[PDB]
Amino acid sequence: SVTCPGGQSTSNSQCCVWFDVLDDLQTNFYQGSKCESPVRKILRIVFHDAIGFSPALTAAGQFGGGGADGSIIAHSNIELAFPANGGLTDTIEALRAVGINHGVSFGDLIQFATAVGMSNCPGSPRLEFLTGRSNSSQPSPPSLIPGPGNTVTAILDRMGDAGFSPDEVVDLLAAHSLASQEGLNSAIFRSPLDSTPQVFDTQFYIETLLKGTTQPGPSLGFAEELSPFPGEFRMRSDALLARDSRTACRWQSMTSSNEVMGQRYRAAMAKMSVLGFDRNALTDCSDVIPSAVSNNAAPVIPGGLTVDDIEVSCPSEPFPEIATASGPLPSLAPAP
Numbered sequence: 519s520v521t522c523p524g525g526q527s528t529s530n531s532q533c534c535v536w537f538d539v540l541d542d543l544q545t546n547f548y549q550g551s552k553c554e555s556p557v558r559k560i561l562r563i564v565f566h567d568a569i570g571f572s573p574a575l576t577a578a579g580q581f582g583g584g585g586a587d588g589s590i591i592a593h594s595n596i597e598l599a600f601p602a603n604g605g606l607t608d609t610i611e612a613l614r615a616v617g618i619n620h621g622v623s624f625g626d627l628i629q630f631a632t633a634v635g636m637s638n639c640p641g642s643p644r645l646e647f648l649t650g651r652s653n654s655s656q657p658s659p660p661s662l663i664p665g666p667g668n669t670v671t672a673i674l675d676r677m678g679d680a681g682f683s684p685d686e687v688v689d690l691l692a693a694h695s696l697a698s699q700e701g702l703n704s705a706i707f708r709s710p711l712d713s714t715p716q717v718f719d720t721q722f723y724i725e726t727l728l729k730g731t732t733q734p735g736p737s738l739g740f741a742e743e744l745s746p747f748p749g750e751f752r753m754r755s756d757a758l759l760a761r762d763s764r765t766a767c768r769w770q771s772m773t774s775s776n777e778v779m780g781q782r783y784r785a786a787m788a789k790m791s792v793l794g795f796d797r798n799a800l801t802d803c804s805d806v807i808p809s810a811v812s813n814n815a816a817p818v819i820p821g822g823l824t825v826d827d828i829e830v831s832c833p834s835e836p837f838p839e840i841a842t843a844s845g846p847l848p849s850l851a852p853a854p
């Protein structure tokens with residue numbers, strides 16, 4: 519086969535350097551293959567790098583962004599000044615050093631680190647990994663990243679211009695199952711968006727549908743909504759997307775099966791990874807990506823709440839039978 523210097527077998531010669539950056543990222547960036555803040559920050563970075571792509575700007579004669587081109591690292595001096603890119607500098611610098619030291623393009627490195635980071639989180643699918651994106655990039659145009667205070671129409675139009683259907687926008691948001699916020703309400707730093715910030719599961723879709731009952735911090739932050747229990751943060755765009763008629767039925771369908779959720783998320787991420795590129799010009803090195811440990815827990819409505827506490831918003835499909843839990847209402851600790 520093509521046997522890499524380390525004895526691993528792979529598809530193509532070009533995949534062998536990625537076994538060295540795999541070891542470096544797992545030992546150093548991810549602190550011993552952990553699923554903590556570095557993974558959550560890299561997931562926010564892959565979205566902010568790739569979504570700087572706009573066919574509408576190109577059509578009007580303007581540069582519309584190179585997509586998944588690593589421009590957020592090569593042109594960090596301009597892209598990290600954008601409102602949406604706060605809290606990312608330290609992760610960007612860490613990634614810059616790995617890219618330089620290994621001689622790989624910045625666009626490829628961000629896609630690789632997302633696939634490897636997710637493999638550290640129980641329940642994750644194995645994401646596709648393609649190599650060969652040119653290292654040359656121009657700065658992304660401003661105002662192409664969706665914000666938590668935007669209306670559902672605004673988010674759907676931005677995402678549609680980039681190439682995503684309403685269903686794929688709901689599918690991409692499965693990444694909020696491994697998420698917290700740091701900059702919307704700094705008083706409750708790293709408050710999780712679902713009760714399992716370290717497990718890639720369906721809890722995010724279930725819990726954003728529950729009635730907002732609780733104010734988790736001393737005041738409300740930017741685009742903050744009432745949440746279902748102490749310690750969980752709910753942002754306005756997630757609350758609105760769960761309830762809007764254009765996205766509500768896809769959101770409800772994501773609540774009962776981790777297997778369907780993983781499959782849909784893997785497909786939407788593969789599409790996002792080549793925005794600005796032709797995937798037929800890239801080399802497939804997906805065999806370098808290791809498997810995640812499986813998640814054996816079933817979907818649940820936490821802490822004694824029942825289906826009467828969820829605000830069913832898909833008028834055509836009845837809400838799935840999800841297991842209920844006993845005990846009092848949970849209070850979530852900060853995400854690690």
Ligand code: HEM
Nearest residue numbers: 558561562565664665666690693697698699700701702755
């Ligand atoms: C409709 C578009 C989306 C909006 C409006 C949005 C907005 C946000 C906001 C405001 C935060 C909190 C940032 C902070 O204050 O620390 C957040 C966190 C996060 N988002 Fe999104 N997001 C969206 C889509 C996505 C997508 C598509 C992905 C990736 C596939 C993603 C991955 C993450 C992750 C993993 C975090 C957690 C970061 C951490 O814990 O440090 N988001 N998002």
Ligand SMILES: *[C@@H]1O[C@H](CO)[C@@H](O[C@@H]2O[C@H](CO)[C@@H](O)[C@H](O)[C@H]2NC(C)=O)[C@H](O)[C@H]1NC(C)=O
Nearest residue numbers: 591592593614617618620621622623624653654
């Ligand atoms: C990809 O392009 C960037 C430049 O945009 C290169 O990054 C520079 O690399 C040099 C030498 O390795 C460093 O001293 C600079 O500080 C880097 N600049 C930035 C903005 O990071 C990078 O080397 C290129 N990588 C490859 C494989 O060609």
Ligand SMILES: O=C(NO)c1ccccc1
Nearest residue numbers: 562601602663664665666
């Ligand atoms: O992460 C964001 N969008 O993905 C974001 C965060 C803060 C403000 C605006 C946008």
Ligand SMILES: [Ca+2]
Nearest residue numbers: 567570585589
């Ligand atoms: Ca980019």
Ligand SMILES: [Ca+2]
Nearest residue numbers: 695714717719
């Ligand atoms: Ca989760």
